[PDB]
């Protein structure tokens, strides 16, 4: 009605029938609800439903009939169906379908609607008399991320149909009777239905933005209160929740409209009683049950996900009876969150030689008797008053540091060299040993040499043979030719036990050395990929400066004595470093303690024993004692191979430490590698001797019980014993332990998981989760509601699954999963309001919003749709800003989202829009998406130039106040962060190829330096990731795709990704280096222009531009060009930022000129610092991603601006020498001379900066891109521009200040000034040798461009009217 304004959004790929849709919908993770749901419709009993909303009104009525969905899950159902999210997990089935199934079906297909697949045989029939086809292609039994399987069989059967028919039902039916039988396992893929058309899909969940692109006209400045009226205004209306949303929407329009009427009513100066405790003035933060959520995960898809996982999380807990507020509040509670703190209580272990019998560390120090500590007293009270930054000075033993060092390895010798023998040069208070590594046989024989020459000679003599054989000769085995040298002189005086010389093997020499050292490395796990070095028994592993770690320690080891002996624990009669052994452990398990402290997984305890109720009741199960506390109570599970005798071996310690500890209830799970024959007969072996369970004397005893006894097989066990597996993600044959959730394993050797290793087990992970779970449990009162050890487990494996971190530390922010209540504090009288009961609630959300923030416009939005949902509770505190130095709101702002779905008057579900209605007639504004992070979005349908929009000039040119735009979600990506094996870095100058059956080259991009950054613009469907063929092959082995997770997780040892979601797919890919390799892919060990030439051009050009204007100047541009070159061009383009009406008209400007063109882009990575003007995101553009936006097949491109003319033939400027530069530029005229006043490159900061280099201009450049990204100039740019850009100021035009600030670091290629004129700063007599001419700005005039062109060109008019008749040509033909 008043002057509005329209935005839609449409997908890539067709809607999917809204059957199949709702399906899928409706049982997300549940299979059971999946083939319940699919008996349903092969009745026909959704036949009768002729439109979509009678077929979704259908599924309420059965959901909740059935018992499937509650109110809670009914109304979260509605949301993710409006949402449309399983659409692309449809297709993804049709992508898949299309690409491998279609062209390995040999055969011609008419009638095979649907048909199973057996044995590679096709069957269109059920009675399945007759085979169409031996189907070719790769395996179709992938196990695959959107498969379902219903059963266990032998056999494997697969039914490809198209539902949406009768024709379904009955080959269905035949499938479902055979798995109910046992014959074969059952699954479901689709097939693309033509009953169906091919509409495009109608998107949701997105938001649009009309943003003022003129902020110049402010005078009057009391903007400081306009945050505080504007959150009085809503707490006095009413109607507070709807208030902030109509104001926050429309906010610019309202901002001299505030103030009015006694407005201030600021009692709410109170609750900065709120501010002085917690959180600073105009900051947006949510909390979701306690979890901080990051800005990314505020959008409709990341909080459906969210929620589902949360309340999955929290119904478990209240089956206990537990109110959802108490469950929270159980969860975010202080002795909980201490406990994962708690990693700063470090665990110790047993460094000593005592076990060895003295005869591994090989220490360069004693500090009791060296005479060069001499100088120093042995006294306590030395260490107790001391003040300052310095290190005690002490003559006594009291901090130890043991390095395991490989000898082969000049990097590990050199450490000893260098490193070590500073240190005691330096005389540190600190002995320093170090243990040799014997993973190798130099290695062992260069251990031997070392030992001897100490043994008898001496320390210095082997040292140095050390010192001496690293510098050059670098030995990796042992030489005599200079261990002969050092015996000659330094074998003056060889003590004690006499020589053997030259020859080593020595019975006790060889043998209890090297072994006593191996059982040393073994013992605390001091070695392999990543070595590990003792520091006070504190495990530091030997990566990047573990010296720094190793001083914060040494540091807080003196604070944790100094207090000691304050208290007068301490004694003159004392070893010192024995105070931190009291409480070491001698054995270190790498399981139990991984170094990498995030290395957990925990399942969910609940879902086990609900899921797998038919396994986990025919299991052996000792129960724990009826005579045990609350506190002793824990539960255990042993997963394990009866079939082999480490999964044996393994049982019989569970055994032996169930009879020591009486609170512990044990279960047996029989987990053998060959299922062929049936795993219920050793089960129920052992059920039948269950009473008689840990009354076995000898291993032997387990053993004949094993063997002895005849049973049949009991199928449904198997059944849901290869179930539970699956569901927590266990390998056949493989051995795990469970105690109270937590996994440990694979076992590789029962050897590492003995009786005595259970107890620690049991110790740690006591204190840890079960510690902290029952004191926060019994503040609240709530300790009745555990009744046993599996009561127990539920809660403690609940809470441990709460802390989980699903997103990686360090990548998107670096703040620890902690669960917050210290918002819990803030009164809320005058600043909040609540929305939902909280005595219901199983979702509390506490948000802060500033109604001041262009965030705050968003946030309320999302919110207002979430807080519909039945279930969820909402609290809003708003806190604005006193300092406001510019103007606050400078957009509107409107949000895509529906809680439930809406249907048309023909019943089919209606389409979401962006309506702006009360539009200003004469601002001007610019169409801004705000769109979730996966999604790639540009314009399709527009007749306005929306980045110049104003409705009185469309009034009076089309007659409509009303406009209507169109986008599309063209592209999903498909992002990771890449990692090196084992030392860990980001391996740049990688370059990575996407493919799919079909085409083996999707598309290619190459892993930048930060994050190990990645990205491929992709739609549903199943794909693979391989490594470049050349130089990236030849040095690296990628193991794995992380889409799992970081991982390692077992199974993700693949490079198979596939995206069926509109949070795209999120990857953490690993490499480790080929055999012995420090080569960089950057740096070469030659047809590599002739291939680009012949793939592209021989000329590829690239611009950019932002109006209409901007655009017909393009098209002038490209036409010069072509006329002056009797040559091949092809023209490049930045996608996004141009018009549909050009978008549409290029094709008719490729066949009149006769060139190519090829549209690129490019997603701002996440990690890189955005550009809130979008003129200078454009100007980011051309120079950040020059080494990804462009294909790596082509070796060179030409940047020419919009306003730009050329009268050369353009080939001249690549064939330009560039001297090995990777890009080159022009310079600023220096011919107009009267004009020096404006040339401010002659000033302090830029001739300071540019001691004789010029000052280059950004209209026109080569870039060398085989060079460019050779020389990895691409990083260097990135990571300078995000540290320049933390200063507003820093850069006024980026586009031409970033190259001359890096021509000192990257060369710039400095050009003839034949190649550019611009009247402002050259010569008229200059132009008669001008090459091409740029329309700089005046700036001692006012005259416009198109003033310039005129004037400054005559042909200008001549290619524009050759365009004019063309696009009438267009418009009448
Ligand atoms: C995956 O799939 C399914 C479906 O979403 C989830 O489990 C379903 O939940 C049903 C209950 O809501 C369950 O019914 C049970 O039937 C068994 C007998 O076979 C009963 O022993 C159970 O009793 C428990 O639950 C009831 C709930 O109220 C029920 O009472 C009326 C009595 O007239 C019943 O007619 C009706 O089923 C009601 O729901 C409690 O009152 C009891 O005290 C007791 O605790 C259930 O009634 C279904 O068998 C089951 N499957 C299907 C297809 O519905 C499953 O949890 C979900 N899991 C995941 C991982 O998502
Ligand atoms: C939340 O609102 C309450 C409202 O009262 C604030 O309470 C403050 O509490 C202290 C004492 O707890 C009050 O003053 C002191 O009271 C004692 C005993 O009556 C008296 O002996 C002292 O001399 C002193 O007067 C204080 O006045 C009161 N504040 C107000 C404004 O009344 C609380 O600080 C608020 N907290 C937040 C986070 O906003
Ligand atoms: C490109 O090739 C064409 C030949 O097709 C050249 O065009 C000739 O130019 C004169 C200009 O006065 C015309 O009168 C002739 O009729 C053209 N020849 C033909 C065959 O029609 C053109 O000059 C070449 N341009 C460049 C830059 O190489
Ligand atoms: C209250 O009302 C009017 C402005 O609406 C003004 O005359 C007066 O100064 C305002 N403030 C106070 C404290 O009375
Ligand atoms: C104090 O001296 C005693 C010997 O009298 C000895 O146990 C130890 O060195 C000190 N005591 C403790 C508890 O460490
Ligand atoms: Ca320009």
Same mark, same amino acid.
């Given at each position: 009605?008043?002057?509005?304004?329209?935005?839609?959004?449409?997908?890539?790929?067709?809607? =999917?029938?809204?059957?199949?849709?709702?399906?899928?919908?409706?049982?997300?993770?549940?299979?059971?609800?999946?083939?319940?749901?699919?008996?349903?419709?092969?009745?026909?009993?959704?036949?009768?439903?002729?439109?979509? #909303?009678?077929?979704?009104?259908?599924?309420?009525?059965?959901?909740?009939?059935?018992?499937?969905?509650?109110?809670?899950?009914?109304?979260?159902?509605?949301?993710?169906?409006?949402?449309?999210?399983?659409?692309?997990?449809?297709?993804?089935?049709?992508?898949?379908?299309?690409?491998?199934?279609?062209?390995?079906?040999?055969?011609?297909?008419?009638?095979?609607?649907?048909?199973?697949?057996?044995?590679?045989?096709?069957?269109?029939?059920?009675?399945?008399?007759?085979?169409?086809?031996?189907?070719?292609?790769?395996?179709?039994?992938?196990?695959?991320?959107?498969?379902?399987?219903?059963?266990?069989?032998?056999?494997?059967?697969?039914?490809?149909?198209?539902?949406?028919?009768?024709?379904?039902?009955?080959?269905?039916?035949?499938?479902?009777?055979?798995?109910?039988?046992?014959?074969?396992?059952?699954?479901?893929?689709?097939?693309?239905?033509?009953?169906?058309?091919?509409?495009?899909?109608?998107?949701?969940?997105?938001?649009?933005?009309?943003?003022?692109?003129?902020?110049?006209?402010?005078?009057?400045?009391?903007?400081?209160?306009?945050?505080?009226?504007?959150?009085?205004?809503?707490?006095?209306?009413?109607?507070?929740?709807?208030?902030?949303?109509?104001?926050?929407?429309?906010?610019?329009?309202?901002?001299?409209?505030?103030?009015?009427?006694?407005?201030?009513?600021?009692? !709410?100066?109170?609750?900065?009683?709120?501010?002085?405790?917690?959180?600073?003035?105009?900051?947006?933060?949510?909390?979701?049950?306690?979890?901080?959520?990051?800005?990314?995960?505020?959008?409709?898809?990341?909080?459906?996900?969210?929620?589902?996982?949360?309340?999955?999380?929290?119904?478990?807990?209240?089956?206990?009876?537990?109110?959802?507020?108490?469950?929270?509040?159980?969860?975010?509670?202080?002795?909980?969150?201490?406990?994962?703190?708690?990693?700063?209580?470090?665990?110790?272990?047993?460094?000593?030689?005592?076990?060895?019998?003295?005869?591994?560390?090989?220490?360069?120090?004693?500090?009791?008797?060296?005479?060069?500590?001499?100088?120093?007293?042995?006294?306590?009270?030395?260490?107790?008053?001391?003040?300052?930054?310095? *290190?005690?000075?002490?003559?006594?033993?009291?901090?130890?540091?043991?390095?395991?060092?490989?000898?082969?390895?000049?990097?590990?010798?050199?450490?000893?060299?260098?490193?070590?023998?500073?240190?005691? #040069?330096?005389?540190?208070?600190?002995?320093?040993?170090?243990?040799?590594?014997?993973?190798?046989?130099?290695?062992?024989?260069?251990?031997?040499?070392?030992?001897? *020459?100490?043994?008898?000679?001496?320390?210095?003599?082997?040292?140095?043979?050390?010192?001496?054989?690293? !510098?050059?000769?670098?030995?990796?085995?042992?030489?005599?030719?200079?261990?002969?040298?050092?015996?000659?002189?330094?074998?003056?005086?060889?003590?004690?036990?006499?020589?053997?010389?030259?020859?080593?093997?020595?019975?006790?020499?060889?043998?209890?050395?090297?072994?006593?050292?191996?059982?040393?490395?073994?013992?605390?796990?001091?070695?392999?990929?990543?070595?590990?070095?003792?520091?006070?028994?504190?495990?530091?592993?030997?990566?990047?400066?573990?010296?720094?770690?190793?001083?914060?320690?040494?540091?807080? /080891?003196?604070?944790?004595?100094?207090?000691?002996?304050?208290?007068?624990?301490?004694?003159?009669?004392?070893?010192?470093?024995?105070?931190?052994?009291?409480?070491?452990?001698?054995?270190?398990?790498?399981?139990?303690?991984?170094?990498?402290?995030?290395?957990?997984?925990?399942?969910?305890?609940?879902?086990?024993?609900?899921?797998?109720?038919?396994?986990?009741?025919?299991?052996?199960?000792?129960?724990?004692?009826?005579?045990?506390?609350?506190?002793?109570?824990?539960?255990?599970?042993?997963?394990?191979?009866?079939?082999?005798?480490?999964?044996?071996?393994?049982?019989?310690?569970?055994?032996?430490?169930?009879?020591?500890?009486?609170?512990?209830?044990?279960?047996?799970?029989?987990?053998?590698?060959?299922?062929?024959?049936?795993?219920?007969?050793?089960?129920?072996?052992?059920?039948?001797?269950?009473?008689?369970?840990?009354?076995?004397?000898?291993?032997?005893?387990?053993?004949?019980?094993?063997?002895? &006894?005849?049973?049949?097989?009991?199928?449904?066990?198997?059944?849901?014993?290869?179930?539970?597996?699956?569901?927590?993600?266990?390998?056949?044959?493989?051995?795990?332990?469970?105690?109270?959730?937590?996994?440990?394993?694979?076992?590789?050797?029962?050897?590492?998981?003995?009786?005595?290793?259970?107890?620690?087990?049991?110790?740690?992970?006591?204190?840890?989760?079960?510690?902290?779970?029952?004191?926060?449990?019994?503040?609240?009162?709530?300790?009745?509601?555990?009744?046993?050890?599996?009561?127990?487990?539920?809660?403690?494996?609940?809470?441990?699954?709460?802390?989980?971190?699903?997103?990686?530390?360090?990548?998107?922010?670096?703040?620890?999963?902690?669960?917050?209540?210290?918002?819990?504090?803030?009164?809320?009288?005058?600043?909040?309001?609540?929305?939902?009961?909280?005595?219901?609630?199983?979702?509390?959300?506490?948000?802060?919003?500033?109604?001041?923030?262009?965030?705050?416009?968003?946030?309320?939005?999302?919110?207002?749709?979430?807080?519909?949902?039945?279930?969820?509770?909402?609290?809003?505190?708003?806190?604005?800003?006193?300092?406001?130095?510019?103007?606050?709101?400078?957009?509107?702002?409107?949000?895509?989202?529906?809680?439930?779905?809406?249907?048309?008057?023909? &019943?089919?579900?209606?389409?979401?829009?962006?309506?702006?209605?009360?539009?200003?007639?004469?601002?001007?504004?610019?169409? &801004?998406?705000?769109?979730?992070?996966?999604?790639?979005?540009?314009?399709?349908?527009?007749?306005?130039?929306?980045?110049?929009?104003?409705?009185?000039?469309?009034?009076?040119?089309?007659?409509?106040?009303?406009?209507?735009?169109?986008?599309?979600?063209?592209?999903?990506?498909?992002?990771?962060?890449?990692?090196?094996?084992?030392?860990?870095?980001?391996?740049?100058?990688?370059?990575?190829?996407?493919?799919?059956?079909?085409?083996?080259?999707?598309?290619?991009?190459?892993?930048?330096?930060?994050?190990?950054?990645?990205?491929?613009?992709?739609?549903?469907?199943?794909?693979?990731?391989?490594?470049?063929?050349?130089?990236?092959?030849?040095?690296?082995?990628?193991?794995?795709? &992380?889409?799992?997770?970081?991982?390692?997780?077992?199974?993700?040892?693949?490079?198979?990704?596939?995206?069926?979601?509109?949070?795209?797919?999120?990857?953490?890919?690993?490499?480790?280096?080929? =055999?012995?390799?420090?080569?960089?892919?950057?740096?070469?060990?030659?047809?590599?222009?002739?291939?680009?030439?012949?793939?592209?051009?021989?000329?590829?050009?690239?611009?950019?531009?932002?109006?209409?204007?901007?655009?017909?100047?393009?098209?002038?541009?490209?036409?010069?060009?072509?006329?002056?070159?009797?040559?091949?061009?092809?023209?490049?383009?930045?996608?996004?930022?141009?018009?549909?009406?050009?978008?549409?008209?290029?094709?008719?400007?490729?066949?009149?000129?006769?060139?190519?063109?090829?549209?690129?882009?490019?997603?701002?990575?996440?990690?890189?610092?955005?550009?809130?003007?979008?003129?200078?995101?454009?100007?980011?553009?051309?120079?950040?991603?020059?080494?990804?936006?462009?294909? *790596?097949?082509?070796?060179?491109?030409?940047?020419?601006?919009?306003?730009?003319?050329?009268?050369?033939?353009?080939?001249?400027?690549?064939?330009?020498? *560039?001297?090995?530069?990777?890009?080159?530029?022009?310079?600023?005229?220096?011919?107009?001379?009267?004009?020096?006043?404006?040339?401010?490159?002659?000033?302090?900061?830029?001739?300071?900066?540019?001691?004789?280099?010029?000052?280059?201009?950004?209209?026109?450049?080569?870039?060398?891109?085989?060079?460019?990204?050779?020389?990895?100039?691409?990083?260097?740019?990135?990571?300078?521009?995000?540290?320049?850009?933390?200063?507003?100021?820093?850069?006024?035009?980026?586009?031409?200040?970033?190259?001359?600030?890096?021509?000192?670091?990257?060369?710039?290629?400095?050009?003839?000034?034949?190649?550019?004129?611009?009247?402002?700063?050259?010569? /008229?007599?200059?132009?008669?040798?001008?090459?091409?001419?740029?329309?700089?700005?005046?700036?001692?005039?006012?005259?416009?461009?198109?003033?310039?062109?005129?004037?400054?060109?005559?042909?200008?008019?001549?290619?524009?009217?050759?365009?004019?008749?063309?696009?009438?040509?267009?418009?009448?033909?």
């Amino acid at each position: 009605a008043s002057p509005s304004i329209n935005v839609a959004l449409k997908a890539a790929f067709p809607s =999917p029938p809204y059957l199949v849709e709702l399906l899928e919908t409706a049982a997300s993770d549940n299979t059971t609800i999946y083939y319940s749901l699919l008996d349903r419709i092969a009745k026909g009993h959704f036949a009768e439903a002729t439109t979509d #909303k009678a077929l979704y009104e259908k599924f309420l009525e059965v959901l909740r009939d059935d018992g499937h969905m509650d109110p809670e899950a009914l109304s979260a159902f509605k949301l993710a169906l409006s949402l449309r999210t399983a659409t692309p997990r449809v297709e993804a089935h049709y992508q898949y379908y299309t690409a491998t199934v279609e062209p390995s079906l040999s055969g011609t297909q008419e009638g095979c609607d649907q048909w199973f697949l057996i044995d590679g045989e096709q069957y269109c029939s059920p009675t399945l008399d007759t085979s169409h086809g031996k189907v070719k292609g790769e395996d179709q039994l992938r196990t695959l991320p959107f498969d379902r399987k219903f059963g266990v069989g032998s056999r494997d059967v697969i039914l490809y149909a198209d539902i949406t028919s009768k024709s379904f039902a009955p080959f269905h039916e035949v499938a479902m009777d055979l798995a109910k039988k046992g014959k074969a396992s059952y699954r479901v893929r689709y097939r693309r239905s033509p009953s169906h058309s091919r509409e495009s899909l109608s998107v949701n969940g997105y938001g649009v933005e009309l943003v003022l692109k003129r902020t110049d006209y402010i005078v009057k400045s009391e903007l400081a209160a306009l945050g505080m009226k504007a959150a009085s205004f809503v707490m006095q209306s009413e109607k507070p929740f709807e208030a902030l949303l109509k104001l926050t929407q429309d906010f610019p329009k309202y901002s001299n409209s505030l103030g009015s009427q006694n407005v201030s009513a600021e009692f !709410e100066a109170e609750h900065r009683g709120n501010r002085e405790v917690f959180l600073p003035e105009g900051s947006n933060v949510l909390w979701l049950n306690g979890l901080h959520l990051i800005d990314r995960q505020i959008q409709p898809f990341g909080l459906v996900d969210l929620l589902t996982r949360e309340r999955k999380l929290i119904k478990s807990v209240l089956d206990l009876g537990l109110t959802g507020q108490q469950a929270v509040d159980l969860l975010g509670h202080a002795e909980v969150a201490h406990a994962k703190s708690g990693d700063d209580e470090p665990r110790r272990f047993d460094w000593r030689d005592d076990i060895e019998e003295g005869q591994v560390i090989i220490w360069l120090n004693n500090l009791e008797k060296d005479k060069r500590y001499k100088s120093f007293s042995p006294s306590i009270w030395v260490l107790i008053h001391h003040f300052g930054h310095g *290190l005690p000075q002490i003559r006594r033993d009291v901090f130890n540091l043991v390095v395991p060092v490989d000898l082969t390895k000049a990097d590990d010798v050199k450490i000893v060299v260098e490193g070590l023998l500073s240190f005691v #040069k330096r005389l540190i208070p600190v002995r320093f040993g170090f243990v040799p590594l014997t993973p190798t046989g130099q290695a062992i024989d260069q251990a031997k040499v070392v030992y001897y *020459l100490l043994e008898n000679y001496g320390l210095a003599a082997a040292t140095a043979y050390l010192e001496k054989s690293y !510098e050059e000769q670098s030995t990796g085995q042992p030489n005599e030719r200079i261990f002969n040298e050092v015996i000659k002189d330094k074998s003056l005086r060889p003590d004690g036990v006499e020589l053997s010389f030259k020859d080593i093997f020595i019975s006790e020499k060889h043998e209890k050395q090297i072994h006593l050292s191996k059982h040393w490395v073994e013992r605390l796990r001091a070695g392999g990929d990543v070595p590990t070095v003792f520091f006070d028994g504190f495990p530091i592993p030997r990566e990047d400066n573990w010296l720094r770690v190793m001083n914060h320690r040494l540091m807080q /080891d003196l604070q944790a004595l100094q207090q000691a002996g304050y208290f007068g624990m301490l004694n003159e009669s004392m070893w010192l470093p024995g105070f931190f052994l009291e409480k070491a452990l001698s054995r270190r398990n790498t399981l139990i303690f991984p170094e990498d402290k995030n290395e957990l997984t925990v399942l969910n305890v609940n879902k086990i024993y609900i899921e797998n109720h038919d396994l986990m009741s025919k299991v052996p199960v000792i129960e724990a004692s009826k005579e045990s506390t609350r506190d002793d109570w824990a539960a255990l599970t042993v997963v394990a191979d009866l079939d082999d005798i480490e999964g044996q071996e393994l049982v019989y310690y569970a055994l032996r430490f169930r009879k020591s500890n009486d609170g512990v209830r044990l279960d047996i799970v029989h987990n053998p590698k060959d299922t062929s024959r049936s795993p219920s007969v050793l089960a129920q072996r052992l059920k039948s001797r269950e009473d008689k369970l840990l009354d076995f004397t000898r291993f032997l005893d387990l053993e004949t019980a094993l063997e002895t &006894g005849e049973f049949e097989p009991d199928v449904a066990y198997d059944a849901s014993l290869a179930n539970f597996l699956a569901s927590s993600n266990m390998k056949a044959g493989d051995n795990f332990v469970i105690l109270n959730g937590r996994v440990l394993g694979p076992i590789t050797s029962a050897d590492d998981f003995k009786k005595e290793d259970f107890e620690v087990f049991l110790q740690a992970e006591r204190r840890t989760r079960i510690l902290p779970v029952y004191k926060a449990l019994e503040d609240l009162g709530l300790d009745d509601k555990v009744s046993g050890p599996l009561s127990a487990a539920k809660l403690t494996s609940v809470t441990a699954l709460s802390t989980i971190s699903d997103l990686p530390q360090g990548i998107f922010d670096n703040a620890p999963t902690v669960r917050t209540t210290l918002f819990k504090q803030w009164n809320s009288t005058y600043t909040s309001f609540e929305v939902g009961d909280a005595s219901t609630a199983t979702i509390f959300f506490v948000a802060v919003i500033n109604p001041a923030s262009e965030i705050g416009q968003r946030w309320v939005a999302v919110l207002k749709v979430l807080s519909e949902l039945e279930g969820v509770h909402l609290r809003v505190f708003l806190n604005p800003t006193v300092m406001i130095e510019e103007l606050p709101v400078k957009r509107f702002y409107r949000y895509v989202l529906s809680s439930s779905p809406s249907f048309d008057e023909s &019943g089919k579900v209606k389409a979401l829009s962006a309506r702006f209605t009360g539009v200003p007639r004469e601002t001007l504004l610019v169409v &801004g998406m705000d769109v979730p992070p996966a999604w790639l979005v540009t314009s399709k349908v527009a007749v306005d130039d929306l980045d110049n929009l104003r409705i009185k000039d469309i009034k009076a040119k089309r007659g409509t106040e009303h406009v209507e735009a169109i986008y599309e979600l063209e592209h999903i990506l498909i992002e990771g962060h890449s990692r090196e094996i084992p030392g860990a870095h980001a391996p740049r100058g990688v370059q990575l190829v996407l493919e799919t059956e079909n085409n083996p080259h999707f598309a290619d991009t190459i892993i930048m330096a930060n994050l190990g950054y990645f990205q491929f613009k992709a739609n549903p469907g199943v794909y693979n990731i391989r490594l470049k063929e050349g130089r990236s092959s030849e040095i690296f082995t990628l193991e794995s795709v &992380g889409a799992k997770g970081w991982g390692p997780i077992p199974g993700d040892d693949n490079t198979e990704v596939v995206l069926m979601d509109f949070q795209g797919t999120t990857l953490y890919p690993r490499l480790r280096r080929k =055999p012995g390799m420090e080569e960089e892919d950057v740096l070469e060990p030659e047809a590599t222009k002739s291939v680009s030439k012949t793939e592209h051009a021989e000329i590829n050009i690239f611009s950019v531009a932002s109006g209409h204007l901007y655009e017909r100047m393009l098209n002038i541009m490209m036409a010069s060009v072509m006329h002056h070159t009797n040559h091949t061009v092809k023209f490049w383009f930045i996608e996004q930022f141009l018009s549909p009406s050009f978008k549409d008209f290029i094709p008719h400007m490729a066949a009149e000129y006769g060139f190519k063109y090829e549209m690129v882009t490019y997603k701002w990575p996440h990690w890189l610092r955005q550009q809130k003007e979008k003129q200078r995101e454009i100007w980011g553009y051309k120079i950040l991603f020059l080494d990804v936006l462009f294909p *790596l097949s082509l070796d060179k491109v030409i940047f020419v601006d919009a306003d730009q003319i050329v009268r050369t033939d353009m080939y001249d400027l690549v064939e330009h020498p *560039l001297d090995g530069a990777p890009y080159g530029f022009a310079p600023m005229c220096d011919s107009r001379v009267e004009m020096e006043g404006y040339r401010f490159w002659k000033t302090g900061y830029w001739a300071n900066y540019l001691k004789g280099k010029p000052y280059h201009i950004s209209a026109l450049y080569v870039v060398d891109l085989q060079r460019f990204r050779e020389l990895a100039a691409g990083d260097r740019l990135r990571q300078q521009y995000h540290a320049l850009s933390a200063d507003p100021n820093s850069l006024a035009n980026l586009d031409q200040d970033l190259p001359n600030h890096m021509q000192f670091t990257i060369p710039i290629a400095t050009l003839p000034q034949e190649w550019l004129w611009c009247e402002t700063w050259c010569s /008229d007599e200059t132009l008669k040798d001008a090459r091409t001419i740029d329309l700089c700005n005046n700036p001692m005039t006012k005259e416009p461009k198109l003033d310039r062109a005129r004037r400054q060109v005559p042909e200008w008019t001549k290619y524009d009217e050759e365009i004019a008749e063309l696009a009438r040509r267009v418009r009448e033909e």
